[PDB]
Amino acid sequence: SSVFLFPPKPKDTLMISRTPEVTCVVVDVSQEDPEVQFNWYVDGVEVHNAKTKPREEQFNSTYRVVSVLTVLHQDWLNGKEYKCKVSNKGLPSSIEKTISKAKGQPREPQVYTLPPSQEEMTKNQVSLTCLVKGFYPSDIAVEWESNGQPENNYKTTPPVLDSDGSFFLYSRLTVDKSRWQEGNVFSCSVMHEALHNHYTQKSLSL
Amino acid sequence: EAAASSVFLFPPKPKDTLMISRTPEVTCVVVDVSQEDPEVQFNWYVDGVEVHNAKTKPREEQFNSTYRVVSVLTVLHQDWLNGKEYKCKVSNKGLPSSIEKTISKAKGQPREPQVYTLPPSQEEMTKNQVSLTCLVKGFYPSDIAVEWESNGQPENNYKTTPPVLDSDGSFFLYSRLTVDKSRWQEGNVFSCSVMHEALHNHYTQKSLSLS
Ligand SMILES: *[C@@H]1O[C@H](CO[C@@H]2O[C@@H](C)[C@@H](O)[C@@H](O)[C@@H]2O)[C@@H](O[C@@H]2O[C@H](CO)[C@@H](O[C@@H]3O[C@H](CO[C@H]4O[C@H](CO)[C@@H](O)[C@H](O)[C@@H]4O[C@@H]4O[C@H](CO)[C@@H](O[C@@H]5O[C@H](CO)[C@H](O)[C@H](O)[C@H]5O)[C@H](O)[C@H]4NC(C)=O)[C@@H](O)[C@H](O[C@H]4O[C@H](CO)[C@@H](O)[C@H](O)[C@@H]4O[C@@H]4O[C@H](CO)[C@@H](O)[C@H](O)[C@H]4NC(C)=O)[C@@H]3O)[C@H](O)[C@H]2NC(C)=O)[C@H](O)[C@H]1NC(C)=O
Ligand SMILES: *[C@@H]1O[C@H](CO)[C@@H](O[C@@H]2O[C@H](CO)[C@@H](O[C@@H]3O[C@H](CO[C@H]4O[C@H](CO)[C@@H](O)[C@H](O)[C@@H]4O[C@@H]4O[C@H](CO)[C@@H](O[C@@H]5O[C@H](CO)[C@H](O)[C@H](O)[C@H]5O)[C@H](O)[C@H]4NC(C)=O)[C@@H](O)[C@H](O[C@H]4O[C@H](CO)[C@@H](O)[C@H](O)[C@@H]4O[C@@H]4O[C@H](CO)[C@@H](O)[C@H](O)[C@H]4NC(C)=O)[C@@H]3O)[C@H](O)[C@H]2NC(C)=O)[C@H](O)[C@H]1NC(C)=O
């Protein structure tokens, strides 16, 4: 049996309208194993409002179990520690995993958009780049849109630790050259705790 | 199984395999070695043939009451890039069991990286330092090295993202060099150098200056 503990999604912690939660996952549960149980703690204080799903077989003939705990936004953002403790009913062993927001003064992401290189302009598709740098902690969401509508054809690097202790990443949106040369307006939007309203967006066009 | 999981085998650095004057090494590491354990021994094999030039370091104590033992094998650049398999077999002296790990370069047709340089965003130009960006894309395997230079000298205030798997099965990454706005303003030429097995002479460079 092996245990994984996952943080809330950056968008959830940052929107008053959304609900952040932490997720505790147990794999390699033998069909023989007694009921997998969860005890959840917030800064050492046990809480009882988690939601556990029955075990589910996997493509390797093992079972998997998932417990979800809703968190308060300010609790997560204030650096509270979430601990999941996993055991089997009537056995003594336990495994504990903990997760919390990185500690340290939050720092505002600097967001810059970059057009395609002239050398790439010879191709049928071109790259639109959004540099996001100087942010702390690394929890962040980056999306693209055009003329107000979500664009999907992008990939974003993981946050990378910079020499000054902040993070940066790049997001690359691929578009048809014709759409770029038509003058369409593309936008990068970034959500982060150290932004006003937790949100900023920057435009990019020819 | 707890035994199998305490041997790790690491590849050489991408830059070391691409220049025959550098020294690419495969590294076999055994952790959780006990003080009650006889000497940790290594046998190394290249495509199943035993080689004898590895260098094994004495056990080094870790701050968790265990020892780590490392063996380092120098590899021929051409062997690694041609896909030979490297095997490390670990045993304890006087006992018969062993644990084997194998590594080799990623399989798949290599693909040449396209390298583009991008100047700072006009909005960044109001700052004291600006970002010069190198976009490297379309490459395979993901083994790659990127560095920046100017006027002969390595520039070293730069950081590079890990490769990211793209939809077509190739990789891309970005490297960001940070430089005083003044040095960009003065018309200094900055260059992004890229080393990858699918590049002619394993190396290409692209430069950027104020325009
Ligand atoms: C007691 O302590 C020891 C020592 O740790 C140290 O001391 C303690 C007290 C602490 O202070 C601790 O923080 C200190 O580090 C503990 O030893 C550790 O044991 C764990 C396992 O229990 C090992 O975990 C693996 O880590 C691998 C990555 O290791 C590298 O990166 C970490 C940092 O992220 C470093 O700390 C490591 O040292 C490794 O660093 C690399 O080392 C290479 C060899 O030197 C370097 O390459 C060489 O570099 C030189 C120049 O320097 C030349 O260039 C050479 O040419 C080159 O070869 C390399 O640069 C360097 N990198 C970096 C960034 O530093 C993980 O890869 C590995 O994950 C695999 O296995 C997992 C299973 O455990 C699995 O979950 C993973 O998914 C992954 O699985 C693999 O995946 C691939 C494909 O995805 C598959 O093909 C594989 O088959 C698959 N393998 C599987 C499934 O097995 C592990 O997480 C850890 O490495 C080790 N530390 C050290 C220092 O040895 C010990 O555990 C403690 N014991 C107890 C009881 O507490
Ligand atoms: C049988 O088949 C099973 C299914 O295929 C298989 O189960 C897998 O077992 C693996 C090992 O036993 C296990 O591997 C781990 O994976 C960790 C990351 O997992 C995520 O990403 C995977 C893709 O890489 C996905 O497949 C996973 O499902 C998981 O995906 C995430 O899922 C969560 C929860 O559902 C989700 O979060 C929630 O999303 C919802 C949306 O509905 C909400 O928004 C919630 O609010 C939100 O919380 C994520 O979005 C989702 N993400 C993604 C990207 O999909 C990986 O991190 C583990 O590595 C760590 O631990 C190992 C040691 O075990 C270390 O070696 C390794 O280096 C990592 O070390 C950690 O590093 C951290 C620092 O960054 C540090 O903090 C940790 O302490 C440290 N841990 C250490 C040192 O131990 C690990 O490799 C895999 O996830 C299982 N897959 C599934 C689907 O469960 C089973 O093994 C098979 N049996 C066999 C083969 O015998």
Author numbering:
A (entry chain A): 238 to 443
B (entry chain B): 234 to 444
Show me the paper's own sentences about this structure:
We describe here the functional and structural characteristics of three novel silent Fc designs: huIgG1 sigma (IgG1σ), which is a variant of huIgG1, and huIgG4 sigma1 (IgG4σ1) and huIgG4 sigma2 (IgG4σ2), which are variants of huIgG4. To assess the impact of the silencing mutations on the structure of the Fc, crystal structures of the Fc fragments of huIgG1σ, huIgG4σ1, and huIgG4σ2 were determined to resolutions of 1.90 Å, 1.90 Å, and 1.85 Å, respectively. Crystal structures and simulations of these Fc variants reveal altered conformational preferences within the lower hinge and BC and FG loops relative to wild-type IgG, providing a structural rationalization for diminished Fc receptor engagement.
In contrast, the same residues in chain A of the huIgG4σ2 structure adopt a wild-type-like extended conformation. Structures of huIgG1 in complex with FcγRI and FcγRIIIa have shown the importance for L235 in receptor engagement. This residue was mutated to alanine in both huIgG1σ as well as huIgG4σ1/2, and this mutation likely has a direct effect on receptor engagement. All Fc variants demonstrating this kinked conformation commonly share mutation of a conserved proline at position 238 and have an altered ability to engage Fc receptor. The Ab1 huIgG4 PAA shows a first transition at 69.5 ± 0.1 °C, while the huIgG4σ1 is at 62.0 ± 0.2 °C and the huIgG4σ2 is at 61.2 ± 0.6 °C, suggesting that the huIgG4 PAA is more thermally stable than its variants.
